[PDB]
Design a protein around this ligand. Sequence first.
Ligand SMILES: COc1cc(Cl)cc(CN2CCC(NC(=O)COc3ccc(S(N)(=O)=O)cc3)CC2)c1OC(C)C
Length: 377
Amino acid sequence: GSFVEMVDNLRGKSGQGYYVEMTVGSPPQTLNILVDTGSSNFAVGAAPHPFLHRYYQRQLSSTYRDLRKGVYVPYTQGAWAGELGTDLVSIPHGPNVTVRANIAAITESDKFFINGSNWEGILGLAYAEIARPDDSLEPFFDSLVKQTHVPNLFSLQLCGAVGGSMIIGGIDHSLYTGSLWYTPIRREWYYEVIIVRVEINGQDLKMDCKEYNYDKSIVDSGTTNLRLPKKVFEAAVKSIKAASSTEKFPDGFWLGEQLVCWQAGTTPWNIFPVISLYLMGEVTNQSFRITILPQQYLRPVEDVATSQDDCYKFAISQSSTGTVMGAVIMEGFYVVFDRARKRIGFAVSACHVHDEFRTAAVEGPFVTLDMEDCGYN
Ligand SMILES: COc1cc(Cl)cc(CN2CCC(NC(=O)COc3ccc(S(N)(=O)=O)cc3)CC2)c1OC(C)C
């Protein structure tokens, strides 16, 4: 593989996101940056903070240029304020290029930096339409493609229990098995896609597909869980509960309020159903589906101290938008963000967490009519 030096360039915690090393300024200042396909701003801590091991020191960078404008970014969980500017940026374990990119220097924040997360910034990989202050602030990837010959495409292999790979400018065939199935990027703001069908253990949830995408369905490496619209979430939980009747769990478990732990190496994965999401294909009336295992939607909680107990939290929750395909979904696959051809590809990951009975899968093609009517106008 020609992209071998980019393999395993991501690190992280089982629910605190994946980050890549990025070198900023001159002389070099390397920091750990979160890879987020759900946002579009490149920002780094630039002032002391109890949860920051290190930060960007603008005064020490001779190539830093203050844009003399402030920026504020409120996320679904947390927010920060900073100063806009530009500086030289490189990804040591990424493409062999250096570009001058917009960079937000975070000077104040609220519930942003986590105690012992190891990351000091965030790399928004989505489009300009959702960038702050507005769409005039060119996102990092856009600068990369405009300033260099690096192809307009990147792929993510997020491996769960953490590490992974972000391949920029191409596809690394060693990171997946089987074929890559593509779904259209509906609009270029978030990485919006269209879900046309949902099954629990092969059983169709039988809801109007418009409910699956009400508002918008997206692929977001920045969100941990698989988030579903309220009406869809309720139906899905009812079905998952029925399919896992071998054992009973408290209501709060399905609501993510309570956790359930099992003796080390005794989690009854076989009692939980597989979940399949059908995505619009590239050909008229054609779709494909991705199937995830409970090992994906049941995530391990920060262990106490190598104790003989494995605690898990239900990683499917309620969303106030359409379906948000977070890390729990992506961890089972190699995901190709083919911006050049406005499509997202899915293939079984070479690091998919499965067992001897079942495995994550990407299968097709299937015949699905009126898929267009599933999207929100
Ligand atoms: C470890 O923590 C993080 C890891 C990573 Cl990589 C990135 C971030 C920030 N990132 C999270 C993802 C978010 N995505 C959307 O905003 C997409 O649009 C949505 C709209 C509605 C909904 S809802 N209301 O229905 O749930 C959900 C999503 C963008 C911001 C994290 O936060 C830390 C503080 C830095």
